[PDB]
Structure 1
Amino acid sequence: AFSELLDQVGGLGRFQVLQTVALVVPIMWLCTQSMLENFSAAVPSHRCWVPLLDNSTAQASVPGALGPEALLAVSIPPGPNQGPHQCRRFRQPQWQLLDPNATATNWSEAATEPCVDGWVYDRSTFTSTIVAKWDLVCDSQALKPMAQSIYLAGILVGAAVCGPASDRFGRRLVLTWSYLQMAVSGTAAAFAPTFPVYCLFRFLVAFAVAGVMMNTGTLVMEWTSAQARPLVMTLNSLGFSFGHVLMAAVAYGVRDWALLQLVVSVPFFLCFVYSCWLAESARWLLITGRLDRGLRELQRVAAINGKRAVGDTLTPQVLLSAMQEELSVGQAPASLGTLLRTPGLRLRTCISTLCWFAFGFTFFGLALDLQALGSNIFLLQVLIGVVDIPAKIGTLLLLSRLGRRPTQAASLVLAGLCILANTLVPHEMGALRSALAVLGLGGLGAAFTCITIYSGELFPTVLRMTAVGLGQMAARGGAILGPLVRLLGVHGPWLPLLVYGTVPVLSGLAALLLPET
């Protein structure tokens, strides 16, 4: 509400703590939902089905016993990188390759056959996975990143429909509905019997996630006092950062693709259930002509906060008088027609959007394929969650005691350079590769939290909202475009990482031109 009314009710009190505690917790589950792909879509080694081994009758027919390692060569051509070919099989058994003396070069997939009878996967680490359930390998390999893109697409559409809708019906209503939609879609996706159904439910989950993300932040911003807005926003981000540790802790327990999704998405039922006693912001109620309900909510909060007499003395006349400043000036959002037209301000918008897109692209394109970065996913997830916190805390101190532009440029350049260096080093040293990847992800997080603050300060007060929205849209578009880059991995796994390392470096170097503050 207006500063006078909020101060009369009380800037900080019981209700603020209760609402912050209630709203921060679901953000961890939202991060868990976003990062569930690393574990519910793992790609295990997939040999080609062979009747000689799986069908016990044929194997037992041969007198004596033949070791599986020796009997595998006779029916699997030697694939690249000294391994078994992933999507082929010998047309007929070849006992000549059985003798180790003969060179295996003559034995190749030239006279082989495709995987007619299906693939055999590994259940040592993951008991089940979506890839092993719908055969998303070989010719369907490209369908894996696709499922990752559609989900992100949903987020982009969510902010396009949760923007005006929440501005007409309210904040709490949209938040509650999005909680319900998240819970229902997450519960339903676990039972999807076909790939398109799962993709549709994932897209709906993304829609609800975008709605929740916007609305919780808006509500928190409105209710908290002016002096403590950034302090609460950084906590709202720190919750999403702890979401990574939560994700790492959950996946280690349940090894499945349906149980994991169900357990992750079931708490949103409770989130919806208890989200009915949260108060609708009186600011939006009062400006939109809803006076009685806003006054009732203000009195309710005042009674909650421990000041009863102050709330009792309130009357609609003082409420109307105190809010005349906003009503007289009905600030209407200005379109881009008055933003891009001015030649002087073009450069600022161009680089701001460039930075937003660079982070939104590179961070998601790298985080989603967490396997290629290190050896074991669980340790990488835990270390990402642990390291994101100190970087986010130290960025604020750096900004306080250092310029915004140098910090932004250095963070972006360093994150990009660590990501690039991660590829060059060999695969013998897993520890160093994992450390470099973790440092790169932390740098990207720091760059995001710095640019979030930096974007608003550049432009005037009137045009700040449009520029912020443009940056968010560009970052979400980059996030969508991120996963699609992996389709170039057929040439080699190094090219996607090279692109992910080159983009942030150039973005950071470019970001050194726009003025400070």
Structure 2
Amino acid sequence: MRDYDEVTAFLGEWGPFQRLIFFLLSASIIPNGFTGLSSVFLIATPEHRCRVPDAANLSSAWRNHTVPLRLRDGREVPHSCRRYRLATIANFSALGLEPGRDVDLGQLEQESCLDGWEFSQDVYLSTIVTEWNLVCEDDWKAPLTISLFFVGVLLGSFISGQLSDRFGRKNVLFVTMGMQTGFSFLQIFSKNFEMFVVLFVLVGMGQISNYVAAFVLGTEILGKSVRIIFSTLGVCIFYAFGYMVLPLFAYFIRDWRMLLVALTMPGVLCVALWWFIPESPRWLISQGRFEEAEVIIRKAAKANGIVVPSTIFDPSELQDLSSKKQQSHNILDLLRTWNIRMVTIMSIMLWMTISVGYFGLSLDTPNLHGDIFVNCFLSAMVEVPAYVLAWLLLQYLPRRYSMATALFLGGSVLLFMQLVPPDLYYLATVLVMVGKFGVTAAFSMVYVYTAELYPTVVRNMGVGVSSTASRLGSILSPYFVYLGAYDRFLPYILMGSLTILTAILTLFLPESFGTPLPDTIDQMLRVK
């Protein structure tokens, strides 16, 4: 018996086949870039105030003084959820009385907006918040939709695995790509809020599912050395490109339906890949469909120009491949021994906190100062050097000090936010981008570090548990942004404190660099 990576080693590590597969599977990750964080523009809240119908016979003075003024940022602004009793105002205006001259505005009665709201159109022409008035007593519905999107992503994480195992990688990939694109398109025709919410849940489910299927198919087709590069840089950078191009679209298109059309179109464009990506030969061998694997291997050999006679490859060996011992599935293994128990708890908390920080910072961009589109672009762009640095650090430096430093930077920088004087408000944006830089580096590194910490017997299970923890964290991530209304800096204080505690935690994990990866739990490294 032999190994699949050995039997197939004759194809080489790099060449026309593996190159095309690498850049096509990576290109299929772009739509997840602008689909993941489109909520920053689809669910944005413009400035708004109570609407006063023009039927009111109010003087120009009264029309200038129809809403109480409240102070924000040290500056007067119309109160966004309350107005002076329109009937009392109309009675005063009919009597000839005028504000200030005859009326003390400070003691008038107030009511909520019974004629709806007037949203400004300086930035957004329309969004779902303006469509269904998700403001004042409905404001909690705005982040809820985003939480529900990540809820769908959670469910997709469970389902896409089993589906891909039972029906293949390419089939699940393209089916869920089409599902995501179709439900993204359908959302344009949402009559009311509930249909939009449920369609957004399904869109997130499809998005996660097809990301996962692309990742698994790529890490199964590519060779041993290029596998790491694909997993680490290949998909991350093209996700960053998708995110970076999201604000480019949102700048020209400022209507949520036309923006959904624009973000839907690339998904339809990706369907051409069906004729270029083959099914994973390793999976087909797992199902016992050896003729299809043989055909795909011979086609790859022909594409790379390698002569493949019986002396260098034969299906008889293909039919007698080795199978690795099956890994434990019962979760009890992760809790049976004290050391692995503690390592699992720390990894859960580390992944959840890194995810909360990353998605909170991503979703908080429209609340920063300066141009919203420039801020979103800078947020998307600061990830590419974060991935390059993460990759170099993983290649050459111990994981513990690297991740302690990246988290310490990401957390400490945020705590400085409250110390920036308003005159130099732009420094706060600098800090926030450096903050997200650190978080992004840590987020890229943990995917590898955790996979090294667990022994083979349960490695996948442990990684999956920690990954689910991170995904749970992003359900909470839009609510930390929601807290920005109660107190501007509270979200950053929370994120910074939690990140510093996570950076302190990381130092207690055992070091893996430069040591053989363990095979059985008895060989697992001990926590400090």
Question: What letter is aligned with 2:109?
Answer: A
CA distance in 1 between counterparts of 2:478 and 2:464 reads 23
Alpha-carbon offset, residue 308 of structure 1? 4.7
**Corresponding residue for residue 115 of structure 2:** 117
2:502 is the counterpart of 1:502: no
**Corresponding residue for residue 283 of structure 2:** 284
CA contact 1:9–1:310 (8 Å) conserved in 2:
no
1:19-60 per-residue CA deviation (whole Å, 9 max, x = no partner) reads 222222232221101111111111111111113xx45x846x
2:44 is the counterpart of 1:46: no
Q: What is the correspondence of 1:305-344 to structure 2 with a 5 Å cutoff?
A: 305-310=304-309, 314-321=313-320, 323=321, 325-326=322-323, 329-344=324-339
Alpha-carbon offset, residue 98 of structure 1? 5.2
Q: What is the correspondence of 1:235-314 to structure 2 with a 5 Å cutoff?
A: 235-310=234-309, 314=313
CA distance in 2 between counterparts of 1:85 and 1:108 reads 13
Out of 185, 209, 212, the position equivalent to 1:211 is: 209
Any unmatched runs of 5+ in structure 1? none
**Corresponding residue for residue 76 of structure 1:** 67
Partner SS state of residue 44, structure 1: coil
Alpha-carbon offset, residue 314 of structure 1? 4.7
CA distance in 1 between counterparts of 2:99 and 2:67 reads 15
Partner SS state of residue 457, structure 2: coil
Q: What is the correspondence of 1:453-492 to structure 2 with a 5 Å cutoff?
A: 453-489=448-484, 491-492=486-487
CA distance in 2 between counterparts of 1:170 and 1:198 reads 31
Partner SS state of residue 123, structure 1: coil
Q: Say if 1:480 and 1:99 are closer, same or farther in 2 by CA, change over 3 A.
A: closer
Partner SS state of residue 105, structure 2: coil
CA distance in 1 between counterparts of 2:149 and 2:255 reads 20
Q: What is the correspondence of 1:86-125 to structure 2 with a 5 Å cutoff?
A: 86-91=80-85, 92-93=88-89, 106-108=104-106, 111-125=109-123
**Corresponding residue for residue 188 of structure 1:** 186
Question: What letter is aligned with 1:254?
Answer: I
**Corresponding residue for residue 129 of structure 1:** 127
Which stretch of structure 1 is more off in the superposition, 148-157 or 79-88? 79-88
CA distance in 2 between counterparts of 1:98 and 1:332 reads 80
CA distance in 2 between counterparts of 1:332 and 1:381 reads 42
1:184-203 per-residue CA deviation (whole Å, 9 max, x = no partner) reads 01111122121111111111
CA distance in 2 between counterparts of 1:303 and 1:297 reads 10
**Corresponding residue for residue 507 of structure 2:** 512
1:401-424 per-residue CA deviation (whole Å, 9 max, x = no partner) reads 432101101111211122222244
2:388 is the counterpart of 1:397: no
Q: TM-score, normalised by structure 1?
A: 0.91
CA distance in 2 between counterparts of 1:306 and 1:333 reads 41
Alpha-carbon offset, residue 309 of structure 1? 4.0
**Corresponding residue for residue 363 of structure 1:** 358
CA contact 1:73–1:97 (8 Å) conserved in 2:
no
CA contact 2:7–2:313 (8 Å) conserved in 1:
no
Alpha-carbon offset, residue 498 of structure 1? 1.9
What RMSD, in angstroms, separates the aligned Cα atoms of the two structures? 2.3
CA contact 2:362–2:379 (8 Å) conserved in 1:
no
Q: Say if 1:153 and 1:110 are closer, same or farther in 2 by CA, change over 3 A.
A: farther
Which stretch of structure 1 is more off in the superposition, 461-470 or 373-382? 373-382
Q: What is the correspondence of 1:426-441 to structure 2 with a 5 Å cutoff?
A: 426-441=421-436
1:200-245 per-residue CA deviation (whole Å, 9 max, x = no partner) reads 1111111111111111111111111112222222121111122222
CA distance in 2 between counterparts of 1:371 and 1:477 reads 23
Which stretch of structure 1 is more off in the superposition, 293-302 or 448-457? 293-302
Alpha-carbon offset, residue 169 of structure 1? 0.6
Give the percent of matched residue pairs that are identical in Structure 1 and Structure 2. 30
CA distance in 1 between counterparts of 2:309 and 2:144 reads 57
2:137 is the counterpart of 1:142: no
CA contact 1:299–1:312 (8 Å) conserved in 2:
no
**Corresponding residue for residue 349 of structure 2:** 354
Partner SS state of residue 120, structure 1: strand
**Corresponding residue for residue 229 of structure 1:** 227
CA distance in 2 between counterparts of 1:268 and 1:97 reads 61
**Corresponding residue for residue 85 of structure 1:** 79
**Corresponding residue for residue 196 of structure 2:** 198
CA distance in 1 between counterparts of 2:395 and 2:17 reads 30
Any unmatched runs of 5+ in structure 2? 513-528
Alpha-carbon offset, residue 164 of structure 1? 1.1
CA distance in 2 between counterparts of 1:205 and 1:311 reads 48
Q: Say if 1:192 and 1:125 are closer, same or farther in 2 by CA, change over 3 A.
A: same
Q: Say if 1:507 and 1:100 are closer, same or farther in 2 by CA, change over 3 A.
A: same
Q: What is the correspondence of 1:147-186 to structure 2 with a 5 Å cutoff?
A: 147-186=145-184
Question: What letter is aligned with 2:8?
Answer: L
Which stretch of structure 1 is more off in the superposition, 473-482 or 454-463? 454-463
Alpha-carbon offset, residue 180 of structure 1? 0.7
Q: Say if 1:491 and 1:394 are closer, same or farther in 2 by CA, change over 3 A.
A: closer
CA distance in 2 between counterparts of 1:212 and 1:101 reads 66
CA contact 1:90–1:109 (8 Å) conserved in 2:
no
CA contact 1:136–1:144 (8 Å) conserved in 2:
yes
CA distance in 1 between counterparts of 2:490 and 2:285 reads 54
CA contact 2:65–2:99 (8 Å) conserved in 1:
no
CA distance in 1 between counterparts of 2:380 and 2:486 reads 32
Which stretch of structure 1 is more off in the superposition, 487-496 or 252-261? 487-496
Partner SS state of residue 275, structure 1: helix
Q: What is the correspondence of 1:380-395 to structure 2 with a 5 Å cutoff?
A: 380-395=375-390
CA distance in 2 between counterparts of 1:506 and 1:381 reads 28
Partner SS state of residue 167, structure 2: coil
Q: Say if 1:109 and 1:30 are closer, same or farther in 2 by CA, change over 3 A.
A: farther
Count of matched residue positions in the alignment of Structure 1 and Structure 2: 500
Partner SS state of residue 514, structure 1: coil
Q: Say if 1:98 and 1:443 are closer, same or farther in 2 by CA, change over 3 A.
A: farther
